[PDB]
Design a protein around this motif. Structure first.
Motif: not given
Ligand code: 22B
Ligand code: 22B
Ligand code: RET
Ligand code: RET
Ligand code: RET
Lengths: 259, 259, 260
Positions: A1-2, A6, A89, A91, A94-98
């Motif tokens: 996804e990332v 990013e 996590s 981030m 502006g989005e936080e990711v596991d």
């Protein structure tokens, strides 16, 4: 996804992380230029083989750091159950990711840069082909199993198993450096310089498995920005100054290494 | 979208598949221990080159089976139209997914282990550099195209074309084993043992492409649990027993291979 | 997401792209057969080392083109902001997909095939081990940093920085070809044949970074299908005909390179 972009932005935006990577792209690049200039006078082929093998160390390194800084060789992985960093996590913007930031690009390129350090050192010590082969093969095995450890997310146990196997390969390399080559160096007339590089190499190299175990990939006591700077610092000594010292010697003792 | 964790537990709950993997992690580790103690007496650098290359086989093997058992080097791929395995499902738990479990981890590590088996055999046979280079390059090509065949999901025909290319590289290797080194071993005074190891090698290796064609990668008449065990059996002989017979000879005839 | 089958079908149904790939699977195959037949009479181990190194060039190449044609070594990547191909679409499968068709499989196999071209050339020229090691390591670095450039989608500047690093490695190979081995061949007794193959190799290899720069990976003046034919045409000369010319000399002059 990332996305790669990013991760590239994640590096920037984080002064510690960014500085640890961009400073070595600059330093590795400056080293290559300096080393090429320093050895422009060599004439003997064997001395030149040692010089090239040594120069390839920062060549692989500048590429490795570009791979990390660009986000090409970095991924966000989720640690298995029980791992000290499971549920962490990251981030991105502006989005936080596991997950955690896994800079596998380091473990991958070590399989190319460390064999070159060993080849230059071994030749400097007058090693025969059998010992060079042993040191290099087990060195590569060490790097690749360490890479496998970082990339394993299925089991916390498997991660440390890979790590153990890697340590076992590491002892072989240490044995040849501390025991075998220390002896060959005397017979080759390079004991002096070899002692300095051997001590430097062993102490600095021991630092990587320590950093790995303390960072997010291990017990997770050190932040990603800290672990990265620790590796970069080690690299500055284990690669750049190590190469400067070896080449400075080589250019002054071309005749002794010739044979 | 399948996770490493899901593949890891998939190996579990499946006795045949799980046992074929963990059993070789242990046997390979035990082999390494045994070999190291068996070769502690060697002093000749050439004899020790042969010993290290031989020991590297089971070293690559523990890592390979660990990659498989951990789920790191396994994936679920969807086979192309017309393929006997096309249309199959696996279900990594409660949510079933289309495709087949591909243990490409095996094909990948073969490119590292087989070249070492060949290195040991060639050295034992007193091979010159040209033949060693030829055997090793075509062996690697054989393994990499076999890995490509397994990872190709676009066309049934492409999969088999890859398989054909791999077979042509294999004939090159077989040719050097049966024709060239068999002759070279006479000059090296190792015809006796080489003939033994040579016979074992050719017979065992020939089985790998047969298993591939019968398993899920080919006509799919054999379940992965069986194909995995077949390979495991082949490895036990082509790798561990092969390594023992070669090393046991080396320790009793170090003076022969020396020089 | 973008499936391997979708790329395979994309290649097919696209006459230009398909031909550039399938024609070379065929030519590489025929080359291997021809070269094996040509070198049947060789007996000297050094002469045979040169022949085998040369033959491995089309072996790696047939595998490379199969990887591209099968879609195994092709991907659709979205170029970064500022890239002349940013915002491009490829129309894959039954939907329009953003990005560009990246045939990275070429860059990856060059790392295996180009070192063989160099090994055969260096041996022909009677090169010592130091120059061979230098030529091969920097050639591999050139190829790997080239693969990294095409695979980098985060920053337009990073793509060109990789490209520059790659070019720096290329100059090392060019220096060894044009300066070092040019002189070593005189001692080796292969001055004329090496000079011919040296020039052919330098002229053709210079074509690759030019095509990269003009293609979708670069300033995008050349669409993927045309960038692909440019590379395939270059390969026909730098690999297949180059190998044919080298083996043609080798098999009429085995004694000259026999040495040890
Ligand atoms: C990317 C970058 C810089 C790249 C620079 C490169 C690639 C230069 C390489 C030079 C070499 C290898 C020179 C060879 C000599 C030996 C020559 C030989 C043996 C071939 O005769 C010697 C004595 C070792 O300096 C900077 C940022
Ligand atoms: C895919 C395809 C064909 C593939 C063909 C292959 C793999 C055959 C390779 C043969 C070789 C390398 C023979 C070795 C000889 C030397 C023998 C030796 C050095 C071993 O003694 C020599 C003189 C070089 O031809 C076709 C379509
Ligand atoms: C330029 C980089 C250098 C000199 C890197 C050296 C790296 C090591 C000595 C790494 C060793 C590791 C282990 C012994 C255990 C598992 C993890 C590793 C890969 C960090
Ligand atoms: C330790 C592993 C060994 C000795 C493996 C040997 C493997 C082979 C001889 C594999 C050969 C294959 C072909 C000739 C065709 C395509 C598929 C393969 C990879 C199974
Ligand atoms: C069979 C393939 C051959 C002879 C390929 C040769 C490729 C090159 C000379 C590539 C060089 C490149 C650069 C100098 C810069 C970055 C991009 C490349 C990889 C196209």
């Amino acid at each position: 996804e990332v996305t790669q972009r990013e991760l590239f932005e994640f590096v920037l935006n984080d002064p510690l992380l960014a500085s640890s990577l961009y400073i070595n792209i600059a330093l590795a690049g400056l080293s290559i230029l300096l080393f090429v200039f320093m050895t422009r006078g060599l004439d003997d082929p064997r001395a030149k083989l040692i010089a090239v093998s040594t120069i390839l160390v920062p060549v692989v390194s500048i590429a490795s750091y570009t791979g990390l800084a660009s986000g090409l060789t970095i991924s966000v992985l989720e640690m298995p159950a029980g791992h000290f960093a499971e549920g962490s996590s990251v981030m991105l913007g502006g989005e936080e990711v596991d997950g955690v930031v896994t800079m596998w690009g380091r473990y991958l390129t070590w399989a190319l840069s460390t064999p070159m350090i060993l080849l230059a050192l071994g030749l400097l010590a007058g090693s025969n082909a059998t010992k060079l082969f042993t040191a290099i093969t087990f060195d590569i095995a060490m790097c690749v199993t360490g890479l496998a450890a970082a990339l394993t997310t299925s089991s916390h146990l498997m991660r440390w198993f890979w790590y153990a196997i890697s340590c076992a390969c590491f002892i072989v390399v240490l044995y040849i450096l501390l025991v075998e080559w220390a002896q060959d160096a005397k017979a080759a007339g390079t004991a002096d310089i070899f002692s300095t590089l051997k001590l430097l190499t062993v102490v600095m190299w021991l630092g990587y498995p320590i950093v790995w175990a303390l960072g997010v990939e291990g017990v997770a006591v050190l932040p990603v920005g800290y672990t990265s700077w620790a590796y970069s610092a080690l690299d500055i000594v284990a690669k750049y100054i190590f190469a400067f010292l070896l080449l400075n010697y080589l250019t002054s003792n071309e005749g002794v290494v010739s044979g």
